[PDB]
Design an enzyme around this catalytic site. Structure first.
Site, PDB file in Angstrom:
ATOM      1  N   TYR A  11      11.148   3.870   7.885  1.00  0.00           N
ATOM      2  CA  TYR A  11      11.319   2.691   8.744  1.00  0.00           C
ATOM      3  C   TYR A  11      10.100   1.753   8.757  1.00  0.00           C
ATOM      4  O   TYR A  11       9.953   0.954   9.690  1.00  0.00           O
ATOM      5  CB  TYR A  11      11.673   3.112  10.184  1.00  0.00           C
ATOM      6  N   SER A  12       9.224   1.868   7.746  1.00  0.00           N
ATOM      7  CA  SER A  12       8.036   1.023   7.680  1.00  0.00           C
ATOM      8  C   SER A  12       7.583   0.737   6.265  1.00  0.00           C
ATOM      9  O   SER A  12       7.878   1.502   5.339  1.00  0.00           O
ATOM     10  CB  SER A  12       6.890   1.620   8.497  1.00  0.00           C
ATOM     11  N   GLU A  13       6.863  -0.371   6.103  1.00  0.00           N
ATOM     12  CA  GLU A  13       6.264  -0.776   4.832  1.00  0.00           C
ATOM     13  C   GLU A  13       4.856  -1.219   5.182  1.00  0.00           C
ATOM     14  O   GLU A  13       4.686  -1.939   6.162  1.00  0.00           O
ATOM     15  CB  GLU A  13       7.045  -1.938   4.202  1.00  0.00           C
ATOM     16  N   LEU A  55       0.822  -1.209   0.000  1.00  0.00           N
ATOM     17  CA  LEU A  55       0.000   0.000   0.000  1.00  0.00           C
ATOM     18  C   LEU A  55       0.861   1.266   0.000  1.00  0.00           C
ATOM     19  O   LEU A  55       0.468   2.291  -0.568  1.00  0.00           O
ATOM     20  CB  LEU A  55      -0.964   0.009   1.189  1.00  0.00           C
ATOM     21  N   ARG A  57       4.932   3.100   1.847  1.00  0.00           N
ATOM     22  CA  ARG A  57       6.107   2.953   2.700  1.00  0.00           C
ATOM     23  C   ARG A  57       6.541   4.251   3.344  1.00  0.00           C
ATOM     24  O   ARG A  57       6.133   5.335   2.915  1.00  0.00           O
ATOM     25  CB  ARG A  57       7.280   2.287   1.936  1.00  0.00           C
ATOM     26  N   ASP A 113       1.198  13.720  15.985  1.00  0.00           N
ATOM     27  CA  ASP A 113       1.457  13.605  14.540  1.00  0.00           C
ATOM     28  C   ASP A 113       0.142  13.744  13.747  1.00  0.00           C
ATOM     29  O   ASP A 113      -0.111  13.021  12.782  1.00  0.00           O
ATOM     30  CB  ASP A 113       2.267  12.343  14.205  1.00  0.00           C
TER      31      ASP A 113
HETATM   32  N1  42J Z   1       1.785   7.702   8.547  1.00  0.00           N
HETATM   33  C1  42J Z   1       1.059   6.717   7.739  1.00  0.00           C
HETATM   34  C2  42J Z   1       0.794   7.196   6.296  1.00  0.00           C
HETATM   35  C3  42J Z   1      -0.025   6.218   5.487  1.00  0.00           C
HETATM   36  C4  42J Z   1      -1.409   6.292   5.463  1.00  0.00           C
HETATM   37  C5  42J Z   1      -2.157   5.411   4.706  1.00  0.00           C
HETATM   38  C6  42J Z   1      -1.525   4.437   3.958  1.00  0.00           C
HETATM   39 CL1  42J Z   1      -2.482   3.344   3.012  1.00  0.00          CL
HETATM   40  C7  42J Z   1      -0.143   4.349   3.975  1.00  0.00           C
HETATM   41 CL2  42J Z   1       0.682   3.143   3.043  1.00  0.00          CL
HETATM   42  C8  42J Z   1       0.602   5.232   4.734  1.00  0.00           C
HETATM   43  N1  42J Z   2       1.318   4.358   9.966  1.00  0.00           N
HETATM   44  C1  42J Z   2       0.886   3.502  11.071  1.00  0.00           C
HETATM   45  C2  42J Z   2      -0.582   3.170  11.261  1.00  0.00           C
HETATM   46  C3  42J Z   2      -1.233   2.717   9.979  1.00  0.00           C
HETATM   47  C4  42J Z   2      -0.694   3.053   8.743  1.00  0.00           C
HETATM   48  C5  42J Z   2      -1.367   2.771   7.569  1.00  0.00           C
HETATM   49  C6  42J Z   2      -2.582   2.119   7.618  1.00  0.00           C
HETATM   50 CL1  42J Z   2      -3.428   1.827   6.137  1.00  0.00          CL
HETATM   51  C7  42J Z   2      -3.115   1.740   8.847  1.00  0.00           C
HETATM   52 CL2  42J Z   2      -4.602   0.856   8.950  1.00  0.00          CL
HETATM   53  C8  42J Z   2      -2.451   2.047  10.019  1.00  0.00           C
END
Ligand code: 42J
Ligand code: 42J
Ligand code: 42J
Ligand code: 42J
Ligand code: 42J
Ligand code: 42J
Length: 322
Positions: A48-50, A43, A45, A149
């Site tokens: 430090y996360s994917e 979805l 990145r 945030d």
């Molecule tokens: N800080 C989280 C940002 C974010 C929100 C929604 C999605 Cl689907 C993704 Cl990959 C990333």
């Molecule tokens: N970024 C952390 C929390 C998080 C990020 C993206 C998604 Cl789509 C969800 Cl459910 C939750």
């Protein structure tokens, strides 16, 4: 030294709770089974996360999996404890499971699935969704937690189902009155003036400044509203709108030691009327009540901003079901 400050609301929530509630370093994390899930698609990145869409193969339910690079383990424990404490709160993302890769030891958070909706927004839609975010913020502040945030990308909306979730609790922290916090939080455009002037004794009111930045960008169709190019310039962008008179009075009230660098960039700026940002393209989203509400969030003095509960009582929300 700087003048101390305390939150006007939920001041002692953590003070009156046992340490197991707020002592995240002592929290015992228990892993689930990563074999219960199959990744479907990426979805997005972060550094430090994917983030992936996945399926729980034991019940055929879709979920969202956030894989974390464990660069700061104490930070991951904090996010997990906060997510567990807030689980079930109105409009708070639900943490469903916590797993670890059996060979790399990479941890992953598993959330409820949310179908994110990427010009069609009406005045009513902005009031409706702003109220849903306030329910989430009043709940987490009532639970002694500051999100730190708040920004559009951290607000997930499934518009077809009118469903909203406040996500990414990775910067969230427990509020302890008199505690001095790290000011290196929030995304640049949403940082409150307290962070920008290095005033560490901040509180839940930081989230209300960030919420005000989001409201201004939505009603004026200007993304981001305060477009700083660095943290120092961010304060200059705010000063160009709120004026420099009220900024200098804020620094004096809290006896803040203002970085000498601001002398060459801050300048002198008048207080602009919120009406100045209204144009033919955004007038359908602006009203006297919207501007009055915005004016009560975007205040330099963190103690002077509306609390989430006070914000919920504003006339701007008279058209929404409470
Ligand atoms: N800080 C989280 C940002 C974010 C929100 C929604 C999605 Cl689907 C993704 Cl990959 C990333
Ligand atoms: N970024 C952390 C929390 C998080 C990020 C993206 C998604 Cl789509 C969800 Cl459910 C939750
Ligand atoms: N095998 C590492 C990638 C990965 C990370 C998290 C989950 Cl939940 C899954 Cl199925 C797969
Ligand atoms: N990702 C959704 C960002 C957002 C935040 C607040 C509002 Cl009121 C709206 Cl319509 C949209
Ligand atoms: N009610 C929004 C339309 C509108 C008309 C005139 C002015 Cl001066 C403003 Cl700020 C806004
Ligand atoms: N803010 C610039 C002047 C202005 C004020 C209100 C409106 Cl509705 C317009 Cl189009 C233009």
């Amino acid at each position: 030294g700087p003048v101390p400050s305390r939150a006007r609301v939920y001041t002692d929530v953590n003070t009156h709770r046992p340490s197991e509630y707020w002592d995240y370093e002592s929290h015992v994390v228990e892993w689930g089974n990563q074999d219960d899930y199959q990744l479907v698609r990426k979805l997005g990145r972060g550094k430090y996360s994917e983030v992936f869409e996945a399926i729980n193969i034991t019940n055929n339910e879709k979920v969202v999996v956030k894989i974390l690079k464990p660069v700061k383990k104490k930070k991951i424990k904090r996010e997990i404890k906060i997510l567990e404490n807030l689980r079930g709160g109105p409009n708070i993302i639900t943490l469903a499971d916590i797993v670890k890769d059996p060979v790399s030891r990479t941890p992953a958070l598993v959330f409820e699935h949310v179908n994110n909706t990427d010009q069609t927004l009406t005045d009513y839609d902005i009031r409706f969704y702003m109220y849903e975010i306030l329910k989430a913020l009043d709940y987490c502040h009532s639970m002694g937690i500051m999100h730190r945030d708040v920004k559009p990308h951290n607000v997930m909306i499934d518009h077809e189902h009118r469903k909203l979730r406040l996500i990414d609790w990775g910067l969230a922290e427990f509020y302890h009155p008199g505690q001095e916090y790290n000011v290196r939080v929030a995304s640049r455009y949403f940082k409150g003036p307290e962070l920008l002037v290095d005033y560490q004794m901040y509180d839940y009111s930081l989230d209300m400044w960030s919420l005000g930045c989001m409201l201004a960008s939505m009603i004026f169709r200007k993304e981001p509203f305060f477009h700083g190019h660095d943290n120092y310039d961010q304060l200059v962008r705010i000063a160009k709108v709120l004026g420099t008179e009220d900024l200098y009075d804020y620094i004096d009230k809290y006896n803040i030691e203002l970085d000498p660098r601001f002398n060459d960039i801050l300048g002198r700026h008048s207080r602009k009327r919120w009406e100045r940002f209204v144009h033919s393209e955004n007038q359908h989203l602006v009203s006297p009540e919207a501007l009055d509400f915005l004016d009560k969030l975007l205040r330099y003095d963190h103690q002077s901003r509306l609390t989430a509960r006070e914000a919920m009582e504003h006339p701007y929300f008279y058209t929404v079901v409470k």
